[PDB]
Ligand binder design. Structure first.
Ligand code: YUD
Lengths: 99, 99
């Protein structure tokens, strides 16, 4: 599909057996998901943006389906106000910017 | 152009007559640039990011060229970690996401 940017590029994703809404975000190196209780090992991390830093848990090799496109990679989980699909996964679903 | 996402989508911009580098950021509603001198009146505003809220100067109807494409719109100036081009300007240059 082609997504215009008049509105936030929100799409449905599937992660940890749950469906969620997330932004397709070319400004995020990595994917950041709102607080959820994923199983398995994780590593603490701090990520910075406008307003400062938030503490997140880094999970590796997490499977996510974005608009029916499967992807697997690093997912950071923490108190983000929004689910963010970052470039580490956007490359895997074949997403590009075009103008 | 078509821009892949294996690297950060960084582009050269011109604003106030000066060249700068900025990130094409589909997860940003607004365009936020690092502290700089811009001609024109401005008004104090607040914006929130992943880490909280910051004070910005809002410049309206500002001329800005992005990778050779002209836009005129709102530019917020403040302590952002990175120059980001948000959807208010990405729409003006005809930018879409595609997968
Ligand atoms: C530095 C470049 C940018 C700022 C990196 N951001 C990604 C941007 O798209 C954020 C997304 C977003 C955050 C909160 C709420 C809504 C949307 N938009 C943003 O702040 O937009 C501003 C301007 O417009 C307004 O609309 C939206 C909010 C206001 S991040 O979320 O801070 C991030 C993600 C991953 C990762 C990091 C940092 C660090 C490592 C990790 O990979």
């Amino acid at each position: 599909p082609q997504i215009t940017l008049w509105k936030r590029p929100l799409v449905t994703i599937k992660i940890g057996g749950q469906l969620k809404e997330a932004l397709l975000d070319t400004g995020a190196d990595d994917t950041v998901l709102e607080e959820m209780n994923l199983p398995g090992r994780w590593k603490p991390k701090m990520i910075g943006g406008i307003g400062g830093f938030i503490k997140v848990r880094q999970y590796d090799q997490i499977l996510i389906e974005i608009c029916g496109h499967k992807a697997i990679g690093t997912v950071l989980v923490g108190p983000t106000p929004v689910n963010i699909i970052g470039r580490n996964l956007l490359t895997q679903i074949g997403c590009t910017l075009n103008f």
